[PDB]
Design a protein around this ligand. Sequence first.
Ligand SMILES: [Zn+2]
Lengths: 60, 126, 116, 82, 155, 99, 208
Amino acid sequence: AKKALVHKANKKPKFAVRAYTRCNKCGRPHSVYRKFGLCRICLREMAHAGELPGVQKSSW
Amino acid sequence: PIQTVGRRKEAVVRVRLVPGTGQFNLDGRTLENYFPNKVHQQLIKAPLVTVDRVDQFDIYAHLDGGGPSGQAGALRLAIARALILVQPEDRPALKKAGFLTRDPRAIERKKYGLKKARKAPQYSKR
Amino acid sequence: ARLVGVDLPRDKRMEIALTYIYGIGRTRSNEILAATGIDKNMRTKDLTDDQVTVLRDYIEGNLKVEGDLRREVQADIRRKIEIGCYQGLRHRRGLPVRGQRTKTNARTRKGPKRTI
Amino acid sequence: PRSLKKGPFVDDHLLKKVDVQNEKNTKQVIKTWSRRSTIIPDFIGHTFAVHDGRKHVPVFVTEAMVGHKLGEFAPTRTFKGH
Amino acid sequence: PRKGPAPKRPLVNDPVYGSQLVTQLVNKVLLEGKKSLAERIVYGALEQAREKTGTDPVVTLKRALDNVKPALEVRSRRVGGATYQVPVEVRPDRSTTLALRWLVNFSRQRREKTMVERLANEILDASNGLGASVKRREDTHKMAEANRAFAHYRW
Amino acid sequence: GQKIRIRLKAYDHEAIDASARKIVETVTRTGASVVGPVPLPTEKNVYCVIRSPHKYKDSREHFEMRTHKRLIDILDPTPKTVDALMRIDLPASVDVNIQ
Amino acid sequence: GQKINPHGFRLGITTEWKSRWYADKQYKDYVKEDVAIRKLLATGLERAGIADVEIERTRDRVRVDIHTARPGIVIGRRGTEADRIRADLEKLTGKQVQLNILEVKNPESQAQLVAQGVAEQLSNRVAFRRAMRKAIQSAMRQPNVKGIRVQCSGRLGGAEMSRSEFYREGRVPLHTLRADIDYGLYEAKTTFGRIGVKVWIYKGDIVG
RNA sequence: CUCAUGUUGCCAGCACGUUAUGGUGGGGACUCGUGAGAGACUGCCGGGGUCAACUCGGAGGAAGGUGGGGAUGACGUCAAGUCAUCAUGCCCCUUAUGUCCAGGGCUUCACACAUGCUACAAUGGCCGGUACAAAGGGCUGCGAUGCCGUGAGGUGGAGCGAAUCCUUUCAAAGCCGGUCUCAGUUCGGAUCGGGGUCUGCAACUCGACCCCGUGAAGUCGGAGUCGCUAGUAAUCGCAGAUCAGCAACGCU
RNA sequence: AGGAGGUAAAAAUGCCAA
Ligand SMILES: [Zn+2]
C-alpha cells in the first residue's frame, strides 16, 4: 500500500461509512479478518510461525 | 432394567425394554404414526422376525438427530442389541444377518476446489 | 362469458378466470371475489348475469383496468421519455432501464440475437 | 427510493443558493456538483449546470421533472455505436 | 474395474409383496433421490393392473418381464477401420436390468397423463406382448440375428 | 448457602488441565465442597485462506481455533476459600472468570 | 511452492507457540501490539543473534522473553541498551514490561542462528560453498544434532541468474511428524540483491 | 467399548407442576459433552505358495486385510504466476509519475467465449395440516413475548459475552387432504408501469427486499463435450468469512 | 521344454535466441 493511504485509513473519516480495515501488518485492504486485523497472507505467515495463540492448522 | 443405543449417520436412539405385548412407542407415538412408511417399519421389525420372538417385547424409544431412514437404522441396531442383552444365544442368528453391525457410512466432507464431496466443476481444455 | 370487454375462458375456476383481465391477477381476483361474495371455486359455465353485473360494478368502481390501464402505462413511459430522463434515454435506445448488465445479457430488451 | 420518514434529500449548499436566487427573484445559472439532490417544487423555474464528470451541462427544470434527482438529466457515458 | 469385478449390492425383499423384483423396479423408476415417491408410484401401478386383470400383480409383472427380456445383444467394435456390430449373449441379471430399464423408459413416454397410470398400462401391454418395450426387444433380437456372420470374433 | 462459579477458558489443553488441578487442590486444602472439573463443549472457529498471493484460488489451506472449557463450582464459600481463590496464580494461557 | 513451514506443520504436536496469552475482546489490540514489538526488536539489534522472541501478556503487565546468541551486546553493563529497548517498549505502551534476555546454550545447533551466520558470511564476501560447509560441520559437531540440511537460493556470487543449492548431511525426515525439526530462514542483504538461506536441523524425535 | 464425569447437558426410578414444555425440587440409570484407555496386528484356522514374501477362503469382532476422509507435494520441469501482500538490485519522476478533495469511471455494448442459476412442467403447480438435522454466529452485537402493518418492516426492549439467551421451541424435500387436467396453461419467470421499507452524508449513473399490475424467450436443446463407482451421483434446505448495506445464483 | 494359427481406412505442418 501507499503510506498516504495506510495513514489515512486510521484518521477519523468525516463520515462513518468511509472507514475500512487495511491489515495492520502490511496494509492490504482486501481480505482482512476482523478477529486478527491481518490480511490472509499475513495471517498465514504468522500462524505458521506460531505467533497466533491458538491458531493451528486444521484437518478434519 | 434394560437400555441400549443405536447410531446411524448422526441419529441416536435409546431403547428401554418391557416384556409385555408387542406395541411400539416412539416418543409418545406408535410405529404407525412415527415412521408411516412400510419399508422403514419392516426394517424396524426385522430383528424380531429373524429371532422369532415377535410381540414378546414392549419398547419405549427416544429418537434424536438424523432423519427418518437414519432413525430407522438406529432403532434396528438398538432392538438387536437389546435382544442380545436379553439372551446371549441369539447372537449366532442375529449377528449372521448383520443386525449387530453398526453401519459406518456417514456424509463425506466437502473438499475445496470441488463443488461437493467428489463431484468436480466443469472442465474445458480450450 | 363477457366481462368489461373480455371473453372469459369457457371452463375455468372463477379466481383464475378473472386473471384474463389486463388489470387483475390472482391476489386481485381473490380480493374481488371475496368482497363481492361469489365462490372462487365456481366454474365459468354456471356464471349468472346477476353475478356478471355485480363483478362488473365492483371492478369498475374500485380498479382501473384494460384500456384505461394500458393507456396510463404508455402515458407514463411517454412522460419519462419526454422529459429526457436517463430512463427515457434507455427506453429510446431499447436497453434495460433498471441498470442491469448489458455487456452480455439484456437479450430480452435487445430482441432477437443478430450476429456480426 | 429514500424513506418518507426522512424526507427528500436536498443538500444545504444548493438549497441555500436556490433560496437566495429565488428570494432575489433573479434566475441565474447555478453551477453545482450535486447529482445526488432530488428536485423540490421550489426548483421549477431555475436552471442548473450539473457536472457529468467532464463538464457542466445546463439543465432547465420543468413541472414534470419534480421528484427526480438532478443527476438524471446529465448523461455521463457517451455511446455512439460501432 | 481394471483389477477385477466389483461386488454386487444386497437387494432387499419387498415388504408389501415379498418379491425383490418389485424393489428392483422401484429402484429403476426412482428419480431425484426420492425413494418413497417411486415406491408409491409402483404400488399404485400394481394395484391398477390388479384391478384391470383380476390376477396377481407380481405374476403379471414377471410375465411382462420375461416377455421383454432379451437373450442376444449387439456390442459394437471397430475392426479394420469399419465398425462392426458383434452379437453377444446376455447373462440373466443383465437381461433383467435391461428389460426393466426399457419398461420404465418407454412408460415415461406414454400419454396417459400420470405415471401411476402409464406404468400400469405399459406393464399390462407388455404382459400381452404388444407394448413399445416388446417392440424394442424384437428390434434388438432382429439386429442380433442380422449379423450372425460377425459372431466369429467372439469378443 | 452461596455458590461461586469458576469458568476456565484455554487455548491449550494441558494448561486447562493443570489449572483445574491447582484450583481443586487449593480449595479443598481449605475444606470446601467441589463438584469437580465439569467439561464443556469446545468452540472451533475455522478460517479458510488461499495459499498464494495473486490467484491460484483452488489451492486453499484451512485453519482452526479451539477454545476448551472446564466448569468449577465451589459450595459453601468460606472467606478463607475466597481469599485463597483471589490469590491463586495461574498461567497466562488460562483465563479464570470468578463470579 | 513445494514444502510448508515445518514449525507450522508441527505446531500442535512437537513445537510450541511463540506467544502465549488469551484475550477475546482484546485479540486485535494484542496482535497489533505483538507485531509492533517484533518489528521493533527485529529492526533494532542485528549485532547479537536474536534466535527467538516470545511474548506473554497478563492484564496490564507484559513479559517479553528474547533468546540471544550473545547477551553482552544486547544489554550494556551500565544498562544502556536495556534502557533503550525498555524505552521503546514503553513507547509501545504495553504498560509494565518485565523484560528478560536469555542466552541460547548451543549456538550452532539453532537453525535460525546458523542461517543468520551463513547470511553474515555470504553478505560480507564469503563463497557460498565455504559458508555451507562451515555451517554443516559446525552443526554436526554437536551431539544432539542428528542431521542438517542447508539451502540458499538467489544470485550466488553475483551471477545474473537464479541458482539454488542445498547441502545435506545425516537425516532430515521432513514428512515425519514426531521428528523434532527446527527450521530457520534468513534473507541476506548483498550488493546484487537479497538472497535467502534456509536451514533444517533434525535433533532426534519427541515422544509424548 | 471401558473408567472418570454431572452444568447451562440427559431424565430411567421418585415427587411437585397444569399448560407449556425437564417446567421445578431431585437422580448417573441411558444419552451427550471431553479427558484417560482398550481395540486390527494377516492376530487364529484351512489351501496355495521355494516352507518365503504374498494371496484365496473362514471364525471372532463395531470394524479385516493400507476400515472411511483429511493433513501430508522427493529431485526437478515449465525463464510457469506474482516488482499491485511484503522485501529488494538497477533504471526513471521530484514541482511531478508525490499528496488532498468534489464529480465521474472500473456496471459502457453491434458482438464472441467461459462458469453458473431458474426453467421448459403432472415423479408437477397452488392451498391447509403435520414429522424429523448437523454445523455454526452474536457488545456499542444477537435482539424475544407484545402492539401496529398485507409485506418488506416500525415501537419497544425481555434475556444473553452465551451447552443457559437470541438467532424461533430451530429446517426444506418428506407424509396426509383438496384443486388444477396436458394447455405456452393455475408452467415458466424475464422485462416493463406504479406504490413502498431499510442501510447509509448520500441509492440518478449504480443497493437489497416487499406489495399491485405486466407475463418474454423457453416443448429437453446440432456437431461436439463434462462430472461421477456408495452414503458416491442426483437432488433438498441450513450456517459462516468479507460486510453499515448488498450485485452471494459465488466460495468454504 | 518344443510349437502352430490370427492381428493395422486415412492421419499434412509447426519459427531462426536464451
Ligand atoms: Zn497483511
